[PDB]
């Protein structure tokens, strides 16, 4: 049950002399049971959630996760 986020987050307080292109464009896959503790982490950072996608199976299926 994995999602597929794509997240644009800026650097809040620090001016990072290394590149950190990947630290502004997490387009990772997060599973369902730990997305919502993870979604608030981007949300408290001031990031922007662009899209979320169901990379796994069908919604509404109440068994088999």
């Amino acid at each position: 049950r994995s999602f597929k986020v794509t997240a644009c987050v800026p650097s809040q307080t620090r001016i990072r002399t290394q590149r950190e292109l990947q630290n502004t464009y997490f387009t990772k896959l997060v599973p369902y049971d730990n997305w919502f503790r993870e979604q608030q982490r981007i949300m408290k950072m001031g990031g922007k959630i662009v899209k979320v996608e169901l990379a796994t199976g069908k919604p509404g299926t109440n068994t088999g996760l």
Partner: protein, 160 residues
């Protein structure tokens, strides 16, 4: 199911499923023509199991029938049989599945939340479920209730 729990465990070890567990699926499929009698007997007594286990519960906890509990009135004792029937509509989904993977995702995973959110104490809910799975063990055979009664009594410790 027991097929489903074995293959997700073998994915975690990143190997094929073990010959210890391959006995169990082989034991599940020779008992696949053993599990189906438990499923059909609960069809023939689902109007008999629930209508007796309510009064078994209401003689154990008559705080519910008193005015002020969460099932008081004829419109309110409808759900205190309907939520019990819904749990009888969960075991037969997992008798033939063998284990608790349809028991969890329909019944268990947030059941501390919504009965608190509806105001019903789950200790009364688990009591009638325990009152249910004394009558269903007496209805089934001594060999049927030896394993399904162990499977019956998961839900009482899972709820409360």
């Amino acid at each position: 199911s027991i097929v489903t729990k074995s293959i997700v465990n073998a994915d975690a070890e990143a190997r094929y499923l073990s010959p210890g567990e391959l006995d169990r699926i082989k034991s599940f499929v020779t008992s696949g023509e053993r599990r189906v009698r438990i499923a059909e007997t609960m069809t023939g007594a689902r109007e008999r199991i629930i209508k007796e286990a309510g009064n078994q519960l209401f003689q154990k906890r008559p705080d519910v029938v008193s005015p002020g509990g969460n099932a008081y009135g004829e419109e309110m004792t409808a759900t205190c049989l309907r939520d019990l029937d819904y749990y009888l509509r969960l075991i037969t989904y997992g008798i033939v599945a063998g284990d608790v993977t349809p028991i969890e995702e329909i019944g268990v995973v947030g059941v501390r939340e919504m009965y608190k959110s509806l105001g019903t104490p789950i200790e009364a809910v688990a009591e009638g479920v325990r009152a249910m799975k004394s009558v269903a063990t007496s209805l089934l055979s001594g060999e049927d209730a030896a394993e399904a009664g162990a499977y019956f009594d998961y839900l009482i410790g899972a709820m409360s």
